Amino acid sequence: VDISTLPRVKVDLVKPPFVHAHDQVAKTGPRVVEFTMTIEEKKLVIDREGTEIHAMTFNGSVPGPLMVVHENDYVELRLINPDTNTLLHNIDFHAATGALGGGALTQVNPGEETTLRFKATKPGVFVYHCAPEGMVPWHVTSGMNGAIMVLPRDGLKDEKGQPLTYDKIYYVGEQDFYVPKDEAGNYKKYETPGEAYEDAVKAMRTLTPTHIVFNGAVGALTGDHALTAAVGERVLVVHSQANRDTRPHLIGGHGDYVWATGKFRNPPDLDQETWLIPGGTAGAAFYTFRQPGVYAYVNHNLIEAFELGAAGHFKVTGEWNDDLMTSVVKPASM
Amino acid sequence: VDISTLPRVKVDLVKPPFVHAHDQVAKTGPRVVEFTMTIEEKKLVIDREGTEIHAMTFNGSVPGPLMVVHENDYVELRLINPDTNTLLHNIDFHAATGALGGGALTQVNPGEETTLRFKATKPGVFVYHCAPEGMVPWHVTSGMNGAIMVLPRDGLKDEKGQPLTYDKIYYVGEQDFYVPKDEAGNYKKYETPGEAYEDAVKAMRTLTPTHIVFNGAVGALTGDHALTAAVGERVLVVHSQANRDTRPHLIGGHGDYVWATGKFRNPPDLDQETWLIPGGTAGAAFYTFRQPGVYAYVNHNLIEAFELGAAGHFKVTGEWNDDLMTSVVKPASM
Amino acid sequence: VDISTLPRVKVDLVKPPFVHAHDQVAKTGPRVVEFTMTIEEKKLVIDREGTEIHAMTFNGSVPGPLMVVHENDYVELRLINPDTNTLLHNIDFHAATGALGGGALTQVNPGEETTLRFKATKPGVFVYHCAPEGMVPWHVTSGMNGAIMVLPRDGLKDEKGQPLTYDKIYYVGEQDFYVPKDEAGNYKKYETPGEAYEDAVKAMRTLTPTHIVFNGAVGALTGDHALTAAVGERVLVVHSQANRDTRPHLIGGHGDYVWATGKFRNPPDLDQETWLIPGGTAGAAFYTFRQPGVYAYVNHNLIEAFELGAAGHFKVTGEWNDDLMTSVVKPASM
Ligand SMILES: [Cu+2]
Ligand SMILES: [Cu+2]
Ligand SMILES: [Cu+2]
Ligand SMILES: [Cu+2]
Ligand SMILES: [Cu+2]
Ligand SMILES: [Cu+2]
């Protein structure tokens, strides 16, 4: 078809765990959605003791933003690489087709620009990440990854063909950092990434992470940044992982509907206490809360969650329901 | 509803891999089942060379007991913490709802008691484990975990809606121990857990286990403790893992029906040679034997199974069936 | 039944990633297919810097050959152990039944022979591997593993009951090597396996691989050995893993139909960007290409793929389709 006869929309993205405005049901025919992402290389502090790394990011955040479109639409991305950066970057969509998902067409040196249009033909959640030849793990484990959701034209549908509507939608990306440390057990610091490259390769070859974080920082979704909800509300959590397997868990709740691979053509699973999301993919979980309070959202490899920092929080407002769970006898001292 | 108008039952649990008496089909309406578990901190020897650790357990066993109830019943647990113990414990069900699955209501110091009632609303196998704030991985990888099964009111059903009945039911919990060892490669010994806490944290941060055991000891399900069966019998094996992914395998047999996540609302899978059970969940496998002999039950990460101790045995009585598998020519020396 | 009244066929296998001739639809009734595999212990060079190991193989290749049969057929294997070898070997099928999948009947010392007949009763892809008592991980991680496919009698069927036909079929086995290295970081070399056994056990207990390779060598499916195809062709990739979990990914394409556990009785999944294959099992992926060019086939634990060698290539002939993905603006220097 002649795409020049299709409408065009302009969308400017938000910083996670929030998503830009959208509509769960298509109001029009296929359009051409337009995004604009900027690359940024900056130092980050990821834990409490001020460990710093040289992160590379889309729009200056770990992870990148979530782009929501509809099926059979046209995505047109405008990737910009400013001059103060120093490396060659290129994007790669798991939703595109051919040319390494768009990686062979998007190579940009410092101080350059590129546009790319592709068609979103399959519904579901997908992952995008940088991919320069010879430095793929380094770029992707420094923080250059994100997700993209391609809704069906009629919104979600459970396994019985009945519709599904979510009041809120949150996005969580789990990032594993392999920071190199010396013989003294202290993390080493550098000037610019090129110096840290080789000991980064060594640390990665050790094959175990040093940090695992939600939203690029230990505690970034804890305290005053907790994710909020109300009893009876319907929430969709998208969870992405670009390099390592992860197993999300909502301490207190469950998974009402779960796409553990994130592809909406398949029927979902029901009543999941803990599902598995392979490395390099995204998944979706639909849950509607029943009791108020504070929920935890962890990676149920409990060592990673409570020693490397893969834990966030949920604050849900409401009042108790003492039929589901009550304390018959308060903790008593005999 | 007014629960005071519901029957009450008293159940006393057994030591695994055996389950207390129950009925796969509900004979009455919803009841209130009553369990009573006691906490015990004791030294354990987990391998052949007498490596000892400071295990913490429910009812003095690793893992804890399996509690079988029916859907939409009321579970009332009475947790007791004696005075000779020295830590603060609290239980946490993945089947409950709200208050961290019951963890915020069950904190008991040494020499205390607590009751808690909740409603079992979802059918399937779930995991329960200790969870004190700040020592969750330590408590859960010292041995404070177990499972709980919530049958449907009509018993199991395959993917074609036909019933399913098991003659035997066994329960297996896989436990990974990170015992700290010194520079000499020898495992270190202590007085009480508080001393071992910090090197335990270090060993856990190494992120690889030192032992992996079925029923809390290397060889605990081998030799005279092998699990017994007969040709044509129907067995349901429940398998639980609270912290690490595992992949069960029955060398010689298969999986006739498999709930790899352990939720009975979903249809099962068929003819599984090896399924995956994520960390922090339980799964169920229904198998009916055909040939007699000795079967192995391993974790098919063969290194873990045959070097760290994740292997058990099955003794099935009967006589051969030389149509399925025969030796046309005996091993001959040319 | 009396098998002596059934036809007999003779099949001689090929070296992977190619499969011997077969027919996706059964032309006759059940037969007795006859294979003959020879054991070979030889030195291998697995990477670019000439690291050598003492591999043990079926027919002198890593992995072994793929055997394609039909359901309810009779497989008759003739395993031969020559005299220049020095160890005791025995085969073990995950598709057989009883006697450890055939491991208790097939023990052969150097200079011996054995035949074994079993019935292929379940359709799907299965794994076979050596299994001598006490050296199972060593034998299986030195390279003694392969796969076997048991097609249904009517060929494959998608989830809507419609047939499925593949023009090409490729087979890929992922092998993880734990080569022992000294204090200097250099890989140690030996004379014969018996010497290397103990440091091999130590290296395996470290629990992280040193190499991960497709077809037993770094780059073995890259360059002039790339897997070939044409736009619009239909390919079935079988992927096997005997010891460790793996997550295949086709950079640029997708998975049109995926049996992630490899059992054809279950319905497949659709539009998989990355599926998970547990350790000790095989899986199947049906894909039909749309755009030409060079595709990568990686294990999407990107560190393993691009640092340990788990990557292969696809060359597909044809011409572009600028409706699916086009470059609106060539990379421009502002
Ligand atoms: Cu980059
Ligand atoms: Cu990728
Ligand atoms: Cu405890
Ligand atoms: Cu838990
Ligand atoms: Cu062998
Ligand atoms: Cu096996």
Tab-separated table of C-alpha atoms in Angstrom, chain C:
chain	number	residue	atom	x	y	z
C	1	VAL	CA	2.581	-59.139	18.537
C	2	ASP	CA	5.217	-61.166	16.679
C	3	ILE	CA	7.750	-58.599	15.470
C	4	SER	CA	9.394	-61.167	13.170
C	5	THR	CA	6.469	-60.498	10.795
C	6	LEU	CA	7.314	-56.782	10.445
C	7	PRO	CA	9.408	-55.170	7.686
C	8	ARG	CA	12.979	-54.091	8.328
C	9	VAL	CA	14.732	-50.953	7.095
C	10	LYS	CA	18.408	-50.002	7.131
C	11	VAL	CA	19.369	-46.374	7.775
C	12	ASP	CA	22.881	-44.925	7.813
C	13	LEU	CA	23.145	-41.557	9.534
C	14	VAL	CA	24.788	-38.300	8.477
C	15	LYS	CA	26.913	-35.757	10.306
C	16	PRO	CA	24.939	-32.819	11.762
C	17	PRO	CA	23.537	-30.224	11.168
C	18	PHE	CA	22.088	-32.433	8.431
C	19	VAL	CA	19.568	-35.249	8.769
C	20	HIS	CA	19.349	-38.496	6.850
C	21	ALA	CA	16.587	-39.020	4.311
C	22	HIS	CA	13.074	-39.636	5.612
C	23	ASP	CA	9.404	-38.990	4.874
C	24	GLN	CA	7.250	-36.662	6.957
C	25	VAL	CA	4.217	-38.898	6.291
C	26	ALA	CA	4.266	-42.636	6.924
C	27	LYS	CA	3.935	-44.585	3.680
C	28	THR	CA	3.635	-48.044	5.263
C	29	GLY	CA	2.755	-49.670	8.566
C	30	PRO	CA	5.081	-49.949	11.557
C	31	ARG	CA	8.544	-51.181	10.635
C	32	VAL	CA	11.847	-51.922	12.361
C	33	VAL	CA	14.410	-49.210	11.668
C	34	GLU	CA	18.055	-50.195	12.099
C	35	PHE	CA	20.839	-47.832	13.145
C	36	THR	CA	24.527	-48.502	13.754
C	37	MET	CA	26.607	-46.090	15.834
C	38	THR	CA	30.307	-46.319	16.657
C	39	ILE	CA	32.022	-44.774	19.662
C	40	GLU	CA	35.164	-42.692	19.222
C	41	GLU	CA	37.474	-41.019	21.735
C	42	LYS	CA	39.507	-38.281	20.105
C	43	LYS	CA	41.078	-34.914	20.763
C	44	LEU	CA	39.152	-31.834	19.680
C	45	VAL	CA	39.977	-28.167	19.192
C	46	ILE	CA	36.979	-26.082	20.171
C	47	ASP	CA	38.035	-22.428	19.875
C	48	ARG	CA	40.268	-20.118	17.842
C	49	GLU	CA	43.333	-20.320	20.108
C	50	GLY	CA	43.527	-24.085	19.710
C	51	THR	CA	42.259	-25.169	23.107
C	52	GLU	CA	42.116	-28.965	22.979
C	53	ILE	CA	39.983	-31.413	24.957
C	54	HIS	CA	39.506	-35.183	25.063
C	55	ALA	CA	36.070	-35.571	23.542
C	56	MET	CA	34.097	-38.811	23.465
C	57	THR	CA	31.542	-39.085	20.694
C	58	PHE	CA	29.081	-41.219	18.778
C	59	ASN	CA	30.350	-41.592	15.194
C	60	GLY	CA	33.082	-39.048	15.890
C	61	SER	CA	31.081	-35.827	16.114
C	62	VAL	CA	29.609	-33.462	18.687
C	63	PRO	CA	26.749	-33.887	18.958
C	64	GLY	CA	25.708	-37.327	17.813
C	65	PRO	CA	23.416	-37.873	14.853
C	66	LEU	CA	19.684	-37.289	14.801
C	67	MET	CA	17.562	-40.393	14.250
C	68	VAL	CA	14.146	-39.790	12.685
C	69	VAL	CA	11.483	-42.477	13.052
C	70	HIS	CA	7.701	-42.642	13.176
C	71	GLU	CA	5.416	-43.258	16.108
C	72	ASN	CA	4.747	-46.841	17.211
C	73	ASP	CA	7.781	-48.055	15.275
C	74	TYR	CA	10.590	-50.262	16.565
C	75	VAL	CA	14.090	-48.841	16.880
C	76	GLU	CA	16.946	-51.355	16.829
C	77	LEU	CA	20.320	-49.839	17.673
C	78	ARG	CA	23.660	-51.614	17.260
C	79	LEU	CA	26.250	-49.933	19.482
C	80	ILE	CA	29.904	-50.862	18.935
C	81	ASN	CA	32.845	-50.042	21.199
C	82	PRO	CA	36.202	-50.570	19.447
C	83	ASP	CA	39.418	-51.666	21.139
C	84	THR	CA	41.487	-48.479	20.892
C	85	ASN	CA	39.072	-46.779	23.285
C	86	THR	CA	39.674	-47.219	26.988
C	87	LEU	CA	36.427	-46.599	28.898
C	88	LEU	CA	33.091	-48.287	29.518
C	89	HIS	CA	30.210	-46.648	27.668
C	90	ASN	CA	26.471	-47.223	27.513
C	91	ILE	CA	23.622	-45.416	25.802
C	92	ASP	CA	20.412	-44.117	27.355
C	93	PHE	CA	17.298	-42.990	25.482
C	94	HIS	CA	14.765	-40.608	26.980
C	95	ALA	CA	12.202	-42.157	24.613
C	96	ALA	CA	12.509	-45.753	25.835
C	97	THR	CA	10.909	-47.244	28.948
C	98	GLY	CA	12.373	-49.126	31.887
C	99	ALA	CA	15.928	-50.094	32.822
C	100	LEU	CA	17.107	-46.479	33.048
C	101	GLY	CA	15.956	-45.826	29.506
C	102	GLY	CA	18.165	-48.666	28.297
C	103	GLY	CA	21.264	-47.861	30.319
C	104	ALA	CA	21.333	-51.036	32.390
C	105	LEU	CA	21.393	-53.231	29.267
C	106	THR	CA	23.948	-51.480	27.056
C	107	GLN	CA	27.175	-51.452	29.071
C	108	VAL	CA	30.034	-52.307	26.700
C	109	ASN	CA	33.740	-52.467	27.495
C	110	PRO	CA	36.398	-51.668	24.881
C	111	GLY	CA	36.109	-54.077	21.978
C	112	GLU	CA	32.480	-55.173	22.350
C	113	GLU	CA	29.108	-54.894	20.650
C	114	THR	CA	25.446	-54.720	21.608
C	115	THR	CA	22.013	-54.483	20.047
C	116	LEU	CA	18.867	-53.148	21.673
C	117	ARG	CA	15.301	-52.885	20.416
C	118	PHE	CA	12.629	-50.644	21.888
C	119	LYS	CA	9.311	-49.191	20.778
C	120	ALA	CA	8.864	-45.493	20.003
C	121	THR	CA	5.479	-44.913	21.597
C	122	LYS	CA	5.442	-41.138	22.171
C	123	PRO	CA	5.890	-38.517	19.434
C	124	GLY	CA	8.337	-35.677	19.846
C	125	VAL	CA	12.041	-34.871	20.123
C	126	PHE	CA	14.037	-36.619	22.836
C	127	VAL	CA	17.627	-36.697	24.058
C	128	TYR	CA	20.004	-39.634	24.397
C	129	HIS	CA	23.293	-39.616	26.282
C	130	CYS	CA	25.884	-41.865	27.872
C	131	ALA	CA	25.431	-42.776	31.515
C	132	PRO	CA	28.067	-44.915	33.266
C	133	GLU	CA	27.587	-45.247	37.002
C	134	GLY	CA	29.763	-42.646	38.698
C	135	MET	CA	30.922	-40.719	35.621
C	136	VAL	CA	27.644	-39.456	34.185
C	137	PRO	CA	28.411	-35.701	34.104
C	138	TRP	CA	31.941	-36.284	32.819
C	139	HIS	CA	30.831	-38.491	29.933
C	140	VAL	CA	27.879	-36.303	29.019
C	141	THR	CA	29.813	-33.019	29.149
C	142	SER	CA	32.649	-34.467	27.123
C	143	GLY	CA	30.252	-34.793	24.202
C	144	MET	CA	28.326	-38.067	24.331
C	145	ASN	CA	24.827	-36.807	23.632
C	146	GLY	CA	22.397	-36.432	20.772
C	147	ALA	CA	18.732	-36.379	19.887
C	148	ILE	CA	16.026	-38.485	18.268
C	149	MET	CA	12.775	-37.408	16.613
C	150	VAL	CA	9.604	-39.510	16.615
C	151	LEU	CA	7.181	-38.000	14.129
C	152	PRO	CA	3.430	-38.598	14.299
C	153	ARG	CA	1.967	-40.847	11.645
C	154	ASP	CA	0.257	-37.914	9.891
C	155	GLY	CA	3.113	-35.432	10.218
C	156	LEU	CA	2.937	-32.257	12.229
C	157	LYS	CA	-0.279	-30.369	12.980
C	158	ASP	CA	-0.673	-26.809	14.232
C	159	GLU	CA	-3.050	-25.849	17.041
C	160	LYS	CA	-5.958	-25.549	14.584
C	161	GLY	CA	-5.537	-29.105	13.325
C	162	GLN	CA	-4.211	-28.025	10.016
C	163	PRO	CA	-1.219	-29.885	8.542
C	164	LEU	CA	2.321	-28.539	8.482
C	165	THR	CA	5.133	-29.336	6.061
C	166	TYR	CA	8.777	-28.299	6.264
C	167	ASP	CA	11.021	-28.096	3.228
C	168	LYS	CA	14.225	-28.262	5.280
C	169	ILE	CA	15.173	-29.689	8.663
C	170	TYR	CA	18.304	-28.742	10.599
C	171	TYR	CA	19.635	-30.041	13.899
C	172	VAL	CA	21.651	-28.024	16.422
C	173	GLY	CA	23.148	-29.290	19.668
C	174	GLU	CA	24.549	-26.892	22.245
C	175	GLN	CA	27.490	-28.238	24.223
C	176	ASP	CA	28.991	-26.707	27.354
C	177	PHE	CA	32.602	-27.546	28.160
C	178	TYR	CA	34.241	-27.120	31.566
C	179	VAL	CA	37.922	-27.284	30.666
C	180	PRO	CA	40.203	-27.219	33.724
C	181	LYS	CA	42.683	-24.371	33.891
C	182	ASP	CA	45.618	-23.830	36.225
C	183	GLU	CA	46.447	-20.870	38.468
C	184	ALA	CA	47.889	-18.985	35.474
C	185	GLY	CA	44.518	-18.904	33.713
C	186	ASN	CA	45.753	-21.205	30.944
C	187	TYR	CA	43.860	-24.349	30.032
C	188	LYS	CA	45.632	-27.517	31.084
C	189	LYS	CA	46.502	-30.308	28.657
C	190	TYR	CA	46.727	-34.039	29.338
C	191	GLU	CA	47.531	-37.427	27.807
C	192	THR	CA	44.335	-39.485	28.152
C	193	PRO	CA	41.001	-38.807	29.889
C	194	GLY	CA	41.774	-40.773	33.054
C	195	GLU	CA	44.386	-38.213	34.036
C	196	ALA	CA	42.075	-35.249	33.451
C	197	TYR	CA	39.167	-36.824	35.351
C	198	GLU	CA	39.748	-35.255	38.761
C	199	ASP	CA	40.385	-31.656	37.762
C	200	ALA	CA	37.447	-32.119	35.408
C	201	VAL	CA	35.314	-32.923	38.449
C	202	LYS	CA	36.632	-29.826	40.213
C	203	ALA	CA	35.934	-27.584	37.219
C	204	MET	CA	32.423	-28.992	36.923
C	205	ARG	CA	31.807	-28.311	40.607
C	206	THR	CA	32.622	-24.665	39.892
C	207	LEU	CA	29.228	-24.871	38.088
C	208	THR	CA	29.936	-22.378	35.301
C	209	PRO	CA	31.007	-23.415	31.801
C	210	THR	CA	34.179	-22.270	30.116
C	211	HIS	CA	32.957	-22.794	26.559
C	212	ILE	CA	29.519	-23.040	24.994
C	213	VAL	CA	29.483	-24.112	21.368
C	214	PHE	CA	27.128	-24.999	18.540
C	215	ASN	CA	28.159	-28.216	16.775
C	216	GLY	CA	31.166	-28.701	19.020
C	217	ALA	CA	33.300	-25.761	17.904
C	218	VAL	CA	33.334	-21.981	18.154
C	219	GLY	CA	32.145	-20.691	14.798
C	220	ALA	CA	31.249	-24.140	13.467
C	221	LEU	CA	28.048	-22.699	11.958
C	222	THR	CA	29.510	-19.382	10.814
C	223	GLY	CA	31.172	-18.293	7.588
C	224	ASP	CA	31.067	-20.875	4.818
C	225	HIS	CA	29.160	-23.382	6.994
C	226	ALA	CA	26.161	-21.082	7.500
C	227	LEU	CA	22.745	-22.704	7.248
C	228	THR	CA	21.127	-21.839	3.930
C	229	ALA	CA	17.535	-21.084	2.980
C	230	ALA	CA	15.345	-19.099	0.599
C	231	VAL	CA	12.577	-16.565	1.135
C	232	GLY	CA	9.295	-18.404	1.550
C	233	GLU	CA	10.934	-21.712	2.450
C	234	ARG	CA	9.823	-23.635	5.536
C	235	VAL	CA	12.491	-24.813	7.971
C	236	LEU	CA	12.290	-26.921	11.111
C	237	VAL	CA	15.147	-26.392	13.550
C	238	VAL	CA	15.595	-29.010	16.243
C	239	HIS	CA	17.623	-27.792	19.209
C	240	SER	CA	18.956	-30.061	21.929
C	241	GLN	CA	20.568	-29.499	25.311
C	242	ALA	CA	21.594	-32.312	27.621
C	243	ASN	CA	22.860	-30.558	30.755
C	244	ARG	CA	22.035	-26.837	30.921
C	245	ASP	CA	19.109	-24.566	30.179
C	246	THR	CA	19.226	-22.633	26.928
C	247	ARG	CA	17.123	-19.953	25.258
C	248	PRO	CA	17.353	-19.929	21.462
C	249	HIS	CA	16.742	-16.794	19.439
C	250	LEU	CA	16.685	-16.012	15.717
C	251	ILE	CA	17.810	-12.405	15.320
C	252	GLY	CA	15.551	-10.940	12.645
C	253	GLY	CA	12.885	-13.621	12.537
C	254	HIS	CA	10.564	-15.193	15.078
C	255	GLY	CA	9.158	-18.579	15.926
C	256	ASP	CA	6.082	-19.299	13.847
C	257	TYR	CA	5.383	-22.524	15.713
C	258	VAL	CA	7.341	-23.633	18.762
C	259	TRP	CA	7.351	-26.834	20.777
C	260	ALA	CA	9.495	-25.573	23.638
C	261	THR	CA	9.509	-28.979	25.313
C	262	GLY	CA	9.489	-30.908	22.049
C	263	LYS	CA	6.384	-33.042	22.580
C	264	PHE	CA	4.030	-32.995	19.609
C	265	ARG	CA	0.904	-34.062	21.502
C	266	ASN	CA	0.613	-30.562	22.948
C	267	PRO	CA	-0.468	-27.502	20.984
C	268	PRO	CA	2.409	-25.257	19.904
C	269	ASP	CA	3.014	-21.636	20.822
C	270	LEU	CA	2.870	-18.764	18.368
C	271	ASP	CA	5.102	-15.783	17.542
C	272	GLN	CA	7.810	-16.623	20.060
C	273	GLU	CA	10.656	-14.138	20.088
C	274	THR	CA	12.606	-16.327	22.527
C	275	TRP	CA	11.589	-19.614	24.126
C	276	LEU	CA	13.185	-21.628	26.914
C	277	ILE	CA	14.489	-25.183	26.528
C	278	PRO	CA	15.266	-26.772	29.924
C	279	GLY	CA	18.447	-28.720	30.432
C	280	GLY	CA	18.242	-32.318	29.342
C	281	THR	CA	15.567	-31.938	26.675
C	282	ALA	CA	15.023	-30.906	23.069
C	283	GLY	CA	12.715	-28.498	21.303
C	284	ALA	CA	11.453	-27.752	17.828
C	285	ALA	CA	10.876	-24.491	15.976
C	286	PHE	CA	9.075	-24.114	12.650
C	287	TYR	CA	9.795	-20.893	10.758
C	288	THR	CA	9.233	-19.672	7.201
C	289	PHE	CA	11.444	-16.801	6.120
C	290	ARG	CA	10.135	-13.594	4.584
C	291	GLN	CA	13.099	-11.318	3.979
C	292	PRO	CA	16.497	-12.321	2.578
C	293	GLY	CA	19.894	-11.676	4.062
C	294	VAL	CA	21.979	-12.910	6.978
C	295	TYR	CA	20.282	-14.038	10.178
C	296	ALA	CA	21.977	-14.887	13.444
C	297	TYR	CA	20.988	-17.812	15.650
C	298	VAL	CA	22.090	-17.166	19.220
C	299	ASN	CA	21.502	-18.208	22.804
C	300	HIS	CA	19.980	-15.055	24.186
C	301	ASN	CA	22.032	-15.047	27.329
C	302	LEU	CA	24.057	-12.534	25.364
C	303	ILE	CA	27.188	-13.070	27.452
C	304	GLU	CA	27.263	-16.769	26.598
C	305	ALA	CA	26.480	-16.122	22.927
C	306	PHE	CA	29.034	-13.388	22.267
C	307	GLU	CA	31.750	-14.427	24.721
C	308	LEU	CA	31.669	-18.234	24.904
C	309	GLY	CA	30.674	-19.019	21.324
C	310	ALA	CA	26.992	-19.977	21.130
C	311	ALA	CA	26.207	-18.352	17.797
C	312	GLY	CA	25.511	-19.555	14.269
C	313	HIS	CA	24.387	-18.056	10.998
C	314	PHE	CA	21.716	-18.284	8.313
C	315	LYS	CA	22.048	-17.187	4.682
C	316	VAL	CA	18.679	-16.713	2.983
C	317	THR	CA	18.466	-15.815	-0.699
C	318	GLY	CA	15.931	-13.461	-2.228
C	319	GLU	CA	15.285	-9.749	-2.574
C	320	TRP	CA	14.068	-7.110	-0.164
C	321	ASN	CA	10.509	-6.287	0.926
C	322	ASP	CA	10.497	-2.585	1.743
C	323	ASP	CA	6.976	-2.672	3.165
C	324	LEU	CA	7.955	-4.664	6.250
C	325	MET	CA	11.060	-2.650	7.119
C	326	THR	CA	12.656	0.261	5.285
C	327	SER	CA	15.180	2.977	6.074
C	328	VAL	CA	13.298	6.244	5.605
C	329	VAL	CA	16.484	8.279	6.060
C	330	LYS	CA	19.934	6.781	5.591
C	331	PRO	CA	22.284	7.330	8.568
C	332	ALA	CA	23.232	10.972	8.050
C	333	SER	CA	25.871	13.135	9.716
C	334	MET	CA	23.546	16.055	10.549
